[PDB]
Every structure is written in C-alpha cells, then in structure tokens.
From Swiss-Prot:
Protein's UniProt name: DDB1- and CUL4-associated factor 1
Positions of short motif DWD box 2: 199-206
Organism: Homo sapiens
WD repeat positions: 12-51, 54-95, 97-134, 136-168, 169-211
Family (UniProt): Belongs to the VPRBP/DCAF1 family.
Motif (DWD box 1): 163-170
Residue span relative to the full protein: 1080 to 1389 of 1507
Domain notes: The protein kinase-like region mediates the threonine-protein kinase activity.
Length: 300
C-alpha cells in the first residue's frame, strides 16, 4: 500500500468527506460529504470538478452504476433517506427511498435497487421506482445492528439480516445462525459462498468452510476481480470504523496485510482496474467540533 495521493475537500475549513466510490471514469472519484453533497474529484491533484447537493444530512453511502448513468446515495437523517440520481447530461433525482438507510444496485443486470430499512429489505424497479418486494420474516430475523441487504452476483438470491432469500419465490431458503450483534453478511463474488462476520458458509451445502477471526466486526469490500477482500472493523461525531483495515486472499481467506492508518476510517473502495485503494481517513478525533477527513489513495 504505497500512498500515491492525498486530498482534502475544497472550499471547507474542515474537510467533510464521508464516503467514496470510483466513477465510471478513471482517475475521478465520487465522494459524499457531511453536508450531503456529492462531489467529483481528480484523485491525483485533488481538484474538485463538480458538486451537487443530494441531501440535507451527511452522505453515508454512494454507489455509481457501472454504465455511468445512475448513482445511489444514502444519508444519515433526511427524508427521503436514500435516493437514485441520474448523471447523464444533467444531474437529477430519479427516485427516492423514504426510510431506507442503505441501498445497492443489483449486480448482473443493474435494473433494480435493494434498500434496507432496519431488519427489512425492499427491492425496487429502477425504471418505475416501484417497490416490487419486501423481504422480512419476523420469525427468522437476527436484528443485526448494521444490517445491509444485498443481492448475489446473479441477482436471484438476497442476504437480509442473516437470512438467505430466493428472489423469484420471495421465500426464505435458510437462516444463518447469529454469532455477532452487528455484521449481517455479504456474498462472495464467486456466487458459492457467503461471508457473515467471522463465518464463511457454503451456499450448496451450508457447511462452515472457514473461520476468519480477523474479519470480526468488519465491513467487507472486494476488489473488482474478486481476488482480494478488504475488511475495516467497526469502531468499538462517531466514525463508523476504526483506524485499521485488513486484506485477505478471497480464494483461501488467508490474511495478506493489516494496515493501521492511525486515523478513523469512514469508507474505502477500489477502482475497476484494481490499481488503487481509496480510503476516507479522519484527521480529527470523534471529539472534534468538526470532522476533517482526507482521501488517501494507495497503489495496491
Ligand atoms: N473529467 C471527468 C469529468 N469531469 C467533469 C467536469 C464537469 C462536470 C459537470 N459540470 C461542471 C462541474 N463543475 N457536471 C457533471 C454532472 C455531474 C454534476 C455533479 C456531480 Cl457531483 C457529478 C456529476 C452532470 C452531467 C453528468 C455529471 N460532470 C462533470 C464532470 C471533468 C474531468
Ligand atoms: O442515525 C441518525 C442520527 O444522525 C444525525 C446526526 O448526524 C451526525 C452524524 C454524521 O453526520 N455522520 C457523518 C457520516 N457518518 C457515516 C459515514 C460513513 C458511513 C459508511 N461508510 C461505509 C459505506 N459507504 N457506512 C455507513 C453504514 C454502514 C455502517 C457500518 C456497516 Cl458494518 C455497514 C454499513 C450505515 C448507513 C449506511 C452504511 N455509515 C456511515 C456513516 C455517520 C456520522
Ligand atoms: Mg446537503
């Protein structure tokens, strides 16, 4: 992790970057801010190229579509709480998700959004914005405090609150046992395994494949090739995460690196070519009057 670049938010006494994702254009990163702005930056010079006010509360998450035409946002304390934006020709709101605290695109075909409202998953059609499906079984709920619903690589399964759902049937296939309070789980890009906190489960047998102790309380991000996973541990203005991230081989789950950047982390992502890791790092403590984040770009 050779540091390659660093930059602070332009035009701000205290820099308020909260989240990041690479754009569909190389060298240009999308960042959300604590004032609910979306920004495009040159990831080398630190030049702000464009700004839009998406929300009147801080951005907690963004996701650009692969085709460059759409963007999902989530905020901390707004109504609507999450939204879908167009970025073709003009920046405009397409749909909103009134109380969803987190949103993701579908994966194989980006024609749907999945939102999370507490323990509940909501699946929306991108074109109409209609809510197609509510996935929630109160008898199977784990009530994970950081529940984030997610599609699998083929968009035909969902993981919500530790429950595996088949999308076509709207049926719960399996409830994974609850072994932590916070982390609800992600699909491996390989489509065969889920990763729920320290447990790696096989989807074709529901056997336990691996225990990975260093994944405890981590929010997991894969690189685009699906060969490496980056975990950033929840903090035990509060930052969501602590000051370290860990990298693992996505094939055998062996640790690769543990990096303590000595600043609390708000987000991290990779570019589509997997050259880089961008991290949002707070120079200020959780006691500071104002956050003062940087984006640091590392060559992987
Ligand atoms: N290269 C990569 C592209 N990049 C620039 C330069 C200008 C842009 C612009 N208008 C002037 C901004 N001050 N609007 C845009 C829009 C936008 C607006 C706000 C945000 Cl936040 C994100 C995107 C609306 C049309 C689609 C995106 N994207 C832009 C990209 C220049 C260097
Ligand atoms: O609650 C409502 C009270 O809020 C009103 C007071 O506001 C002061 C509060 C305020 O402004 N903050 C500035 C912004 N900050 C941030 C900044 C980044 C976040 C993040 N990044 C990674 C994904 N992109 N993920 C997340 C979430 C997450 C967290 C842990 C895990 Cl494991 C999985 C998902 C939770 C919501 C969306 C994914 N949460 C985040 C919060 C909150 C404090
Ligand atoms: Mg705002």
């Amino acid at each position: 992790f050779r540091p390659i670049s660093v930059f602070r938010e332009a035009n701000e006494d205290e820099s308020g970057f909260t989240c990041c994702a690479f754009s569909a254009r190389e060298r240009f990163l999308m960042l959300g801010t604590c004032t609910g702005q979306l920004k495009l930056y040159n990831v080398f010079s630190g030049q702000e190229e464009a700004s839009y006010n998406c929300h009147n509360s801080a951005i907690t998450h963004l996701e650009p579509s692969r085709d460059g035409s759409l963007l999902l946002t989530s905020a901390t304390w707004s109504q609507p709480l999450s939204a879908l934006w167009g970025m073709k020709s003009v920046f405009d709101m397409k749909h909103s998700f009134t109380e969803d605290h987190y949103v993701e695109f579908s994966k194989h075909s980006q024609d749907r959004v999945i939102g999370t409202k507490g323990d509940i998953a909501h699946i929306y059609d991108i074109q109409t914005g209609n809510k197609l499906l509510t996935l929630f079984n109160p008898d199977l709920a784990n009530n994970y405090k950081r529940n984030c619903a997610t599609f699998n690589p083929t968009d035909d399964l969902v993981l919500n609150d530790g429950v595996l759902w088949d999308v076509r049937s709207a049926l719960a296939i399996h409830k994974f046992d609850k072994f932590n309070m916070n982390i609800s789980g992600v699909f491996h890009p390989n489509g065969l395994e889920v990763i729920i906190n320290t447990e790696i489960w096989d989807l074709r047998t529901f056997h336990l494949l691996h225990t990975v102790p260093a994944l405890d309380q981590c929010r997991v991000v894969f690189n685009h090739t699906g060969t490496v996973m980056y975990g950033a541990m929840l903090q035990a203005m509060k930052s969501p995460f602590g000051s370290s991230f860990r990298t693992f081989n996505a094939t055998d789950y062996k640790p690769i690196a543990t990096i303590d950047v000595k600043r609390n982390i708000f987000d991290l992502c990779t570019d589509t070519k997997d050259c880089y890791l961008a991290v949002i790092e707070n120079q200020g403590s959780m006691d500071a009057l104002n956050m003062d984040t940087v984006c640091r770009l590392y060559e992987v």
